[PDB]
Amino acid sequence: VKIFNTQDVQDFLRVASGLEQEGGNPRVKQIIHRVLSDLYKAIEDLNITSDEYWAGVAYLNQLGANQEAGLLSPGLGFDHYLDMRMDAEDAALGIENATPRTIEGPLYVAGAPESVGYARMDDGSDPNGHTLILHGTIFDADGKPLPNAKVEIWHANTKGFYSHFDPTGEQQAFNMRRSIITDENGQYRVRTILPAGYGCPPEGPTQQLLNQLGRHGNRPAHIHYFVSADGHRKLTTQINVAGDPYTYDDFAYATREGLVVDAVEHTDPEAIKANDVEGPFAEMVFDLKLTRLVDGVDNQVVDRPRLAV
Amino acid sequence: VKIFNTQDVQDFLRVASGLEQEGGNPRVKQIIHRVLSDLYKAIEDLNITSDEYWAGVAYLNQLGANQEAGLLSPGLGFDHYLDMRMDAEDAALGIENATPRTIEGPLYVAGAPESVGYARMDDGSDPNGHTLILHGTIFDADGKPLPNAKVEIWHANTKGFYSHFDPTGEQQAFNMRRSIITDENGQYRVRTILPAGYGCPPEGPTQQLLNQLGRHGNRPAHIHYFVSADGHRKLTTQINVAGDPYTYDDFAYATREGLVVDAVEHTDPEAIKANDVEGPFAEMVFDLKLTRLVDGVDNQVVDRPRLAV
Ligand SMILES: CCCCCCCCCCCCCCC(=O)OC[C@H](COP(=O)(O)OCC[N+](C)(C)C)OC(=O)CCCCCCCCC
Ligand SMILES: CCCCCCCCCCCCCCC(=O)OC[C@H](COP(=O)(O)OCC[N+](C)(C)C)OC(=O)CCCCCCCCC
Ligand SMILES: [Fe+3]
Ligand SMILES: [Fe+3]
Ligand SMILES: [Hg+2]
Numbered sequence A, B: 001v002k003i004f005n006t007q008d009v010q011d012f013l014r015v016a017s018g019l020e021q022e023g024g025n026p027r028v029k030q031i032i033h034r035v036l037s038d039l040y041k042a043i044e045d046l047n048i049t050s051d052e053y054w055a056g057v058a059y060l061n062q063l064g065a066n067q068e069a070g071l072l073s074p075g076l077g078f079d080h081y082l083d084m085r086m087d088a089e090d091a092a093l094g095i096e097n098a099t100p101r102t103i104e105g106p107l108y109v110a111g112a113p114e115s116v117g118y119a120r121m122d123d124g125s126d127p128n129g130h131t132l133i134l135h136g137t138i139f140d141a142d143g144k145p146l147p148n149a150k151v152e153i154w155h156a157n158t159k160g161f162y163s164h165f166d167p168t169g170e171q172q173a174f175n176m177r178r179s180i181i182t183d184e185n186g187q188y189r190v191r192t193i194l195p196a197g198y199g200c201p202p203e204g205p206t207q208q209l210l211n212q213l214g215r216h217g218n219r220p221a222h223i224h225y226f227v228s229a230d231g232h233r234k235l236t237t238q239i240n241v242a243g244d245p246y247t248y249d250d251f252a253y254a255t256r257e258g259l260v261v262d263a264v265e266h267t268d269p270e271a272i273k274a275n276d277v278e279g280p281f282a283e284m285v286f287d288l289k290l291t292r293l294v295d296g297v298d299n300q301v302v303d304r305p306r307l308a309v
């Protein structure tokens, strides 16, 4: 069957998109028209049956009902595709951004407490939590320590859950979420625990689709970062814990060279006392170098819906 | 900045789609691969920003959260487009559709009370309800009256609300929903009330997207039909109440020539008595002609999620 290219279908696509209406947002109509066209065409080229179509419509309802659109998004590579575009654009402007950006993920929560230089991130409610001392220096576009920069960090516990999105409900507000303002040496230091990777809600729509593609929905253990400061663009990045089985097989394709960090294990008494911890702990060092604003503006900051508490 | 047609992105689409993956459903991979390719490309061609992208993702969540995917679908012309593909296929097979098909809509409910020849569809709970006597004849593929045919009818009240989907929740199950088995003369007859047209939930995602397209979301008063019988294909259609303002301006583009019917107003005491009514009533006559199975197969019956109570 071939009717997509006839005048009725073509005219119809213009009507449905409201390209004929006088009111509305021209930008939205432009996009809708393009998307309906490609889909109407895809339905023809692939001879998608009504049965298949409605299975797709039902899937769409499940996805939203389970608020998993922002989880399916990175799994189908959009999140990384948008980053790739951001990189292409910077490369075209001669911006040799040292610390590679990667996806933000849908689990950021605004409002975390902030402090200068140091902060313990966890409430110690994780029985299996392994103490982690994470620290580094923030450098400006010139390679100089940058005091006053705001480092935002958020990660999951050993069960792979983030505060505010813990299915088991446990967690205290902003647990494992802090904003650190760099100190006199442009440094930040936090005490938290090693996060574990995690997968998609096992019975959710995202996992359903992934099984159909013969793929897994697991992410390697990682820590999320937000770094902003005057005169510089906001940095969205993360670090992967070295040795994770999914380090290079992240379902969200967020991993990048330069972002995989080694968690050095310490067990000797001198190290333990020095960092005034209570037993063997792991240490990760990660410095971040920021890029300068582009003609006075942050050409790559993203404004997307983020939960605020 | 263009990266879509480079190797990296093209290989990325194959990976995200599970193409080189051994497990999974290749039909789904095929469709996903096509859809992703088109969306990645549309994003680049229309230079969609992350800000715009994430608003789209947010819309998808609320679309599903509100269980409105099946409502937007017809509003964006998919339901009708699929009917067109069906007509085209029937044409290619030489099947002359006497009674034109049209969209089912997302409001069908399975399990309605069943009766032979006659049925009263309402329970009187609608004040402004105006008595409507709808009756007709079902003809088999050879133009002869067909007894024991199953006619299913469903429609909204004067507030434009359907039972099972009534926000005010004052309707009893299956109100204005009935299955009628045709009598010895292949006839069906029901007593009900003239339905009112209806629109999209005003606060819902479908309505808001329609606003951005400068379109409305109203449908003219109509009555839905499902007609099935042994040896025949299941017919999905609906009749439009003549004179409705939106008759040829339905947001679901379901109106069709041959489906618009005139509600005759009867006020003579002799007619009111012959029809066992308590006063002035409206009458609508609509005969439907079925098509025979194709070699024992119903090549157009649609299997889609339908509420069953
Ligand atoms: C309002 C606008 C509407 C736009 C609609 C989108 C376009 C339509 C294309 C959708 C094509 C879907 C075809 C997939 C399919 O034919 O079947 C998909 C699987 C089913 O698996 P089966 O084993 O065959 O089920 C049956 C098992 N039995 C046989 C034992 C019963 O189920 C699933 O949920 C997977 C569905 C994934 C499709 C979602 C794509 C969205 C991504 C952006
Ligand atoms: C899981 C994978 C997901 C793949 C999805 C890819 C699609 C990406 C395209 C998204 C296009 C949306 C961009 C439109 C936009 O930038 O904003 C959309 C409107 C907002 O109104 P504004 O007035 O512009 O807000 C601004 C007010 N200010 C100016 C005062 C600030 O809101 C809306 O809901 C319209 C959004 C509807 C789009 C849904 C299409 C799906 C149907 C097939
Ligand atoms: Fe994460
Ligand atoms: Fe309807
Ligand atoms: Hg990449």
Ligand SMILES: [Hg+2]
Pocket (backbone or CB within 6 Å): A199, A200, A201, A202, A207, A216, A217, A218
């Ligand atoms: Hg998973």
Ligand SMILES: [Hg+2]
Pocket (backbone or CB within 6 Å): A198, A199, A200, A201, A206, A217, A218, A219, A251
């Ligand atoms: Hg996942």
Ligand SMILES: [Hg+2]
Pocket (backbone or CB within 6 Å): A008, A012, B080, B084
């Ligand atoms: Hg049409």
Ligand SMILES: [Hg+2]
Pocket (backbone or CB within 6 Å): B199, B200, B201, B202, B207, B216, B217, B218
């Ligand atoms: Hg509406």
Ligand SMILES: [Hg+2]
Pocket (backbone or CB within 6 Å): B071, B198, B199, B200, B201, B206, B217, B218, B219, B251
């Ligand atoms: Hg509507």
